[PDB]
Symmetry: C2
């Protein structure tokens, strides 16, 4: 097999604990900004966009696809009083998520579920909303992910998603170095996600493209990886670190070259806005 | 002289549209709003302020909105955004606007506000910004580029007047990338444009001019909600405004509104937002 995603997880957990980090919204001067704070800004931003669609009512039922340690779930529960089902393929993360929810006294509001985006273990028309942050990048079968999302959304339910991606019109051949470093076949784009969503009865409400966030974020991640090199070397090997750095440099350069972006979208399960 | 006259009369549609917006919302300018569900219960004023807060927040994250930073408002209208930015950030704003009655009211509002040392109002065209090279820390333009022909010249002037590493924040009703003009002819005809801006075109033009695209936003939901709410308000105020926004004018405005709404729902049209920086990279 290959262990890069595993060892990437080890590195993220070593630095940030069971606090979930995703691509952040950074404030100038970026050098002095912190990844943790910028990630929180993303959470706040995406939650505020989602709130506007009206789905974040007290007691509304949300699904977190690629929930990690459950950080966004706890953030949403506390802010809006929703309930959240977390879905995540990684049993260790699942155990800690549940531990964190118990400790927080939020276990009656958050359920942690094992499984796959390709086979969501839930009834059709179950959810008022879906929240998915930077998780679709790692699923090969994008149509099937969107079919599953549309299936488990209630009519008029809204999905908010974010994902590192390529720009529309960029060929796989143009981005092969990064795909080699992150061990993916290809990546999504706003154009693809929109047409797929539409095939599944999800209308695009709004989209975002933040290649500046992509560049800032992965620059920051690279600096932290560099800083922690000796400290993590027993479980994140020197050769793994080199490969990860190369991958981060590709995100940064692809972003500056107009090939790659950090995209965000809201969809509603409706034929029309 | 015929051209001046004919163009003046064509332009009564723009003038009477302004009479309508001014009648309801006065000198605090309205642009495409960010609406909260249930949209029918939301107010246009509140949504248009959400847009101003959002755009200003995006701009602030770039570092350009320091006290005494100098910005240029392209298509400033009655100066509402300029007053909003000055009170919030303590920047200085030069407004550039083609409508001299709007400019005069703008100055009057700034004088009453006690903001005349921070806001200047200049008459002119985006094709010939009456300012020196490298003058501005930032440019703000809300829904103004829509009407400009010669989009390349607009972006050339924007880049010229920005300082190095200056930032521009714009919003504009637009067509979706990949939509041919042949497919939005009713709306191009109804509002009298050859073709429309789009995120892809603006990015390409900006890049040609040394402006890198930092981020973009497409909100066809806002486009649909905003024009639906404006149409509802026009119907609400029909008899109240009929002396100065004629019945025939109202019918023409309503048709144009319907075209924006229909194009939004058809996935042909959107409301775009972008930030650029004057630099080779990022």
């Amino acid at each position: 097999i290959y262990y890069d995603d595993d060892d990437s997880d080890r590195f993220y957990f070593h630095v940030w604990g069971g606090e979930d980090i995703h691509v952040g919204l950074y404030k100038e001067p970026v050098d002095q900004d912190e990844i943790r704070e910028a990630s929180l800004r993303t959470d706040e931003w995406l939650a505020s966009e989602l709130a506007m669609t009206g789905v974040l009512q007290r007691q509304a039922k949300g699904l977190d696809l690629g929930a990690g340690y459950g950080g966004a779930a706890r953030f949403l529960v506390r802010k809006f009083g929703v309930s959240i089902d977390c879905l995540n393929i990684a049993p260790v993360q699942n155990k800690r998520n549940e531990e964190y929810n118990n400790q927080a006294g939020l276990a009656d509001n958050i359920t942690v579920k094992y499984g796959s985006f390709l086979e969501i273990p839930c009834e059709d028309n179950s959810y008022d909303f879906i929240w998915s942050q930077d998780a679709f990048l790692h699923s090969p079968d994008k149509l099937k992910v969107f079919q599953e999302c549309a299936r488990v959304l209630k009519p008029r339910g809204v999905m908010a998603i974010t994902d590192p991606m390529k720009e529309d019109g960029i060929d796989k051949s143009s981005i092969q170095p990064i795909l080699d470093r992150i061990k993916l076949h290809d990546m999504g784009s706003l154009g693809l996600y929109r047409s797929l969503a539409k095939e599944c009865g999800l209308v695009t409400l709004r989209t975002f493209s933040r290649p500046d966030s992509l560049v800032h974020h992965y620059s920051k991640v690279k600096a932290e990886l560099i800083k922690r090199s000796s400290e993590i070397a027993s479980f994140c090997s020197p050769e793994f670190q080199a490969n990860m750095k190369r991958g981060l440099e590709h995100w940064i350069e692809g972003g500056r070259a107009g090939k790659l972006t950090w995209g965000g979208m809201l969809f509603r399960k409706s034929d029309k806005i």
